[PDB]
Each structure stands twice: as C-alpha cells, then as structure tokens.
Amino acid sequence: GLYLQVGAFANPDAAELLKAKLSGVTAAPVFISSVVRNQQILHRVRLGPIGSADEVSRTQDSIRVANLGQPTLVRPD
Ligand SMILES: CO[C@@H]1O[C@H](CO)[C@@H](O[C@@H]2O[C@H](CO)[C@@H](O[C@@H]3O[C@H](CO)[C@@H](O[C@@H]4O[C@H](CO)[C@@H](O)[C@H](O)[C@H]4NC(C)=O)[C@H](O[C@H](C)C(=O)O)[C@H]3NC(C)=O)[C@H](O)[C@H]2NC(C)=O)[C@H](O[C@H](C)C(=O)O)[C@H]1NC(C)=O
C-alpha cells in the first residue's frame, strides 16, 4: 500500500481543512497523522493506501489540479 503526504501543519485547523478538501478530489482514505517534532505538534495530512503506482500518479495530478499542494510519497509513520 502506497501513501501520499500533501502537507504538514502546526495549525490543526489548516490540516483538517486540507483533509476535507482532499476528500472531494480523491476516493482514497484521507487522514491526519499527528506527531511530536521539534518540540511542537505537527499535523501531517496523508492519503492511502493506494493500490498502484499509476493511481498514485493520477492522484498526485488531481491534487495539483485542485491547487491543494505538492503531494509526495511517504512511507507510513
Ligand atoms: C525530505 O524532507 C521532507 O521534505 C518535505 C518537503 O515537502 C517536508 O514536508 C513539508 O514540510 C513543510 C514544513 O517543513 C510543510 O510546510 C507547511 O507548508 C504550508 C504551505 O503548503 C504552510 O501553510 C501556509 O502558511 C501560510 C503562512 O505561512 C498561510 O498563509 C497559508 O494559508 C498556509 N497554507 C495552508 C494550506 O494552510 C505551513 O505553515 C502553516 C502556517 C502551519 O504550519 O499551519 C507549513 N508548516 C510548517 C510546520 O512549516 C509542507 O506542507 C510539507 N509538505 C508536504 C507535501 O507534506 C517534510 O517535512 C514534514 C514537516 C514532515 O516531516 O512530515 C520533510 N521531512 C523531514 C523528516 O524533514
């Protein structure tokens, strides 16, 4: 299973808003993974698992068309 990260935010409201926006551009599960990093809480907006590289590429394209960020492959944390 393949995963994308679309953004990482200190503001949880920004992360939740991006998660909601992404649900309108992809059918893959969208979730927030929040971690302690550099003495702060970081809210990572992620999606997956995606079943194939081709679907990852098309999902990246749809996120860029929606101007929602520069999505990068991440391995699940
Ligand atoms: C190889 O290392 C990895 O590189 C990744 C490169 O993509 C990196 O991920 C990125 O991390 C940056 C921070 O380091 C993160 O940047 C946030 O960027 C957004 C813009 O997209 C900021 O949001 C905007 O802020 C302005 C004002 O500053 C607002 O006016 C505007 O409305 C905001 N936009 C939205 C949509 O709300 C955001 O700042 C806001 C203020 C916030 O924190 O709430 C930036 N956050 C921070 C904390 O600086 C960027 O989104 C992220 N990109 C992706 C695709 O995830 C990896 O780092 C992240 C943190 C991670 O590790 O998960 C690098 N990994 C490591 C281990 O170093």
Short mmCIF file of all heavy atoms in Angstrom, two decimals, residues 5-11 14 37 42 44 46 70-72, ligand 1:
data_model
loop_
_atom_site.label_atom_id
_atom_site.label_comp_id
_atom_site.label_asym_id
_atom_site.label_seq_id
_atom_site.Cartn_x
_atom_site.Cartn_y
_atom_site.Cartn_z
N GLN A 5 1.74 12.24 1.22
CA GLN A 5 1.55 13.34 2.15
C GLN A 5 1.38 14.61 1.34
O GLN A 5 2.15 14.87 0.41
CB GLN A 5 2.74 13.47 3.11
CG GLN A 5 2.53 14.54 4.15
CD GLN A 5 3.55 14.46 5.27
OE1 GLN A 5 3.64 13.45 5.96
NE2 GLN A 5 4.35 15.53 5.44
N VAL A 6 0.38 15.41 1.70
CA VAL A 6 0.03 16.61 0.94
C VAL A 6 0.50 17.86 1.67
O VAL A 6 0.77 18.90 1.04
CB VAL A 6 -1.48 16.62 0.63
CG1 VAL A 6 -1.85 17.77 -0.29
CG2 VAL A 6 -1.87 15.28 0.01
N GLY A 7 0.58 17.80 2.99
CA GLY A 7 1.06 18.94 3.76
C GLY A 7 1.29 18.53 5.19
O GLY A 7 0.86 17.46 5.63
N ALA A 8 2.00 19.39 5.92
CA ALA A 8 2.21 19.20 7.34
C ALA A 8 2.07 20.56 8.01
O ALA A 8 2.69 21.53 7.56
CB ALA A 8 3.59 18.60 7.62
N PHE A 9 1.28 20.62 9.08
CA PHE A 9 0.87 21.91 9.63
C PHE A 9 0.97 21.93 11.14
O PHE A 9 0.63 20.96 11.82
CB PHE A 9 -0.57 22.24 9.24
CG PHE A 9 -0.79 22.26 7.77
CD1 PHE A 9 -1.21 21.12 7.11
CD2 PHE A 9 -0.55 23.41 7.03
CE1 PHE A 9 -1.41 21.12 5.74
CE2 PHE A 9 -0.76 23.42 5.66
CZ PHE A 9 -1.18 22.27 5.01
N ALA A 10 1.43 23.06 11.67
CA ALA A 10 1.33 23.28 13.10
C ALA A 10 -0.09 23.63 13.52
O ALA A 10 -0.50 23.31 14.64
CB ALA A 10 2.31 24.37 13.53
N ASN A 11 -0.85 24.28 12.63
CA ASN A 11 -2.23 24.66 12.90
C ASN A 11 -3.12 23.46 12.59
O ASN A 11 -3.24 23.09 11.42
CB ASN A 11 -2.61 25.85 12.01
CG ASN A 11 -4.06 26.29 12.15
OD1 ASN A 11 -4.85 25.69 12.88
ND2 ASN A 11 -4.42 27.36 11.45
N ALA A 14 -5.78 24.11 9.88
CA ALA A 14 -5.30 24.05 8.49
C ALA A 14 -5.25 22.61 8.00
O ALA A 14 -5.62 22.32 6.86
CB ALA A 14 -3.93 24.70 8.38
N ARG A 37 7.31 16.81 16.81
CA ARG A 37 8.52 17.06 16.05
C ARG A 37 9.05 18.42 16.46
O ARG A 37 8.31 19.40 16.44
CB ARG A 37 8.22 17.07 14.54
CG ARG A 37 9.38 17.54 13.71
CD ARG A 37 10.35 16.41 13.50
NE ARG A 37 9.86 15.53 12.45
CZ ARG A 37 9.91 15.84 11.16
NH1 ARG A 37 10.44 17.00 10.77
NH2 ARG A 37 9.44 15.00 10.26
N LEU A 42 3.00 18.38 15.01
CA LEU A 42 2.95 18.53 13.57
C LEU A 42 1.82 17.65 13.05
O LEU A 42 1.78 16.46 13.35
CB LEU A 42 4.27 18.06 12.97
CG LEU A 42 4.49 18.21 11.47
CD1 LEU A 42 4.75 19.66 11.11
CD2 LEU A 42 5.65 17.32 11.06
N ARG A 44 0.23 15.99 9.96
CA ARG A 44 0.53 15.59 8.60
C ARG A 44 -0.74 15.10 7.92
O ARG A 44 -1.42 14.22 8.44
CB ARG A 44 1.62 14.52 8.59
CG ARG A 44 2.87 14.96 9.36
CD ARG A 44 3.90 13.86 9.55
NE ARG A 44 3.34 12.66 10.18
CZ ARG A 44 4.06 11.60 10.52
NH1 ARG A 44 5.37 11.59 10.29
NH2 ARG A 44 3.48 10.54 11.06
N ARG A 46 -2.38 13.09 5.04
CA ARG A 46 -1.93 11.97 4.23
C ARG A 46 -3.11 11.27 3.57
O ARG A 46 -4.27 11.44 3.97
CB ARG A 46 -1.16 10.97 5.08
CG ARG A 46 0.17 11.54 5.55
CD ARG A 46 0.96 10.59 6.40
NE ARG A 46 2.32 11.09 6.54
CZ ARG A 46 3.34 10.39 7.00
NH1 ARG A 46 3.15 9.15 7.42
NH2 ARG A 46 4.55 10.93 7.06
N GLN A 70 1.75 20.05 -3.09
CA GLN A 70 2.72 19.29 -3.86
C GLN A 70 2.86 17.92 -3.21
O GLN A 70 3.74 17.70 -2.38
CB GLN A 70 4.07 20.01 -3.88
CG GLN A 70 4.03 21.34 -4.62
CD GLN A 70 3.56 21.18 -6.06
OE1 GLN A 70 3.95 20.24 -6.75
NE2 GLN A 70 2.70 22.10 -6.51
N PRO A 71 2.00 16.96 -3.57
CA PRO A 71 1.94 15.71 -2.81
C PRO A 71 3.15 14.83 -3.08
O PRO A 71 3.57 14.66 -4.22
CB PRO A 71 0.65 15.05 -3.32
CG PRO A 71 0.48 15.59 -4.68
CD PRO A 71 1.02 17.00 -4.66
N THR A 72 3.70 14.26 -2.01
CA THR A 72 4.89 13.43 -2.09
C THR A 72 4.62 12.06 -1.49
O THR A 72 3.85 11.92 -0.53
CB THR A 72 6.12 14.11 -1.45
OG1 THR A 72 6.18 13.82 -0.05
CG2 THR A 72 6.07 15.62 -1.65
C1 LIG B 1 12.76 15.44 2.67
O1 LIG B 1 12.22 16.01 3.86
C2 LIG B 1 10.84 16.21 3.79
O2 LIG B 1 10.57 17.24 2.84
C3 LIG B 1 9.18 17.54 2.72
C4 LIG B 1 9.02 18.53 1.55
O3 LIG B 1 7.67 18.60 1.09
C5 LIG B 1 8.64 18.10 4.06
O4 LIG B 1 7.23 18.39 4.01
C6 LIG B 1 6.73 19.67 4.11
O5 LIG B 1 7.09 20.26 5.35
C7 LIG B 1 6.84 21.67 5.35
C8 LIG B 1 7.42 22.26 6.65
O6 LIG B 1 8.77 21.83 6.80
C9 LIG B 1 5.33 21.95 5.21
O7 LIG B 1 5.13 23.35 5.09
C10 LIG B 1 3.96 23.85 5.60
O8 LIG B 1 3.74 24.46 4.33
C11 LIG B 1 2.42 25.03 4.24
C12 LIG B 1 2.22 25.52 2.79
O9 LIG B 1 1.86 24.42 1.95
C13 LIG B 1 2.26 26.15 5.28
O10 LIG B 1 0.94 26.71 5.21
C14 LIG B 1 0.66 28.01 4.87
O11 LIG B 1 1.23 29.01 5.71
C15 LIG B 1 0.94 30.35 5.26
C16 LIG B 1 1.69 31.28 6.22
O12 LIG B 1 2.98 30.72 6.49
C17 LIG B 1 -0.57 30.59 5.26
O13 LIG B 1 -0.88 31.92 4.80
C18 LIG B 1 -1.26 29.54 4.37
O14 LIG B 1 -2.69 29.71 4.45
C19 LIG B 1 -0.86 28.12 4.80
N1 LIG B 1 -1.42 27.09 3.89
C20 LIG B 1 -2.43 26.24 4.27
C21 LIG B 1 -2.84 25.28 3.19
O15 LIG B 1 -2.95 26.26 5.38
C22 LIG B 1 2.52 25.58 6.69
O16 LIG B 1 2.52 26.66 7.66
C23 LIG B 1 1.26 26.84 8.37
C24 LIG B 1 1.28 28.26 8.92
C25 LIG B 1 1.06 25.79 9.52
O17 LIG B 1 2.08 25.17 9.96
O18 LIG B 1 -0.13 25.65 9.92
C26 LIG B 1 3.87 24.85 6.75
N2 LIG B 1 4.06 24.17 8.03
C27 LIG B 1 5.22 24.25 8.77
C28 LIG B 1 5.15 23.47 10.05
O19 LIG B 1 6.22 24.88 8.44
C29 LIG B 1 4.77 21.26 3.95
O20 LIG B 1 3.33 21.31 3.94
C30 LIG B 1 5.23 19.80 3.84
N3 LIG B 1 4.88 19.26 2.51
C31 LIG B 1 4.27 18.04 2.41
C32 LIG B 1 3.97 17.62 0.99
O21 LIG B 1 3.99 17.36 3.39
C33 LIG B 1 8.89 17.08 5.19
O22 LIG B 1 8.62 17.74 6.45
C34 LIG B 1 7.35 17.46 7.07
C35 LIG B 1 7.16 18.52 8.15
C36 LIG B 1 7.32 16.01 7.65
O23 LIG B 1 8.42 15.54 8.03
O24 LIG B 1 6.20 15.41 7.69
C37 LIG B 1 10.37 16.64 5.20
N4 LIG B 1 10.60 15.56 6.18
C38 LIG B 1 11.60 15.64 7.12
C39 LIG B 1 11.68 14.44 8.02
O25 LIG B 1 12.36 16.60 7.23
#
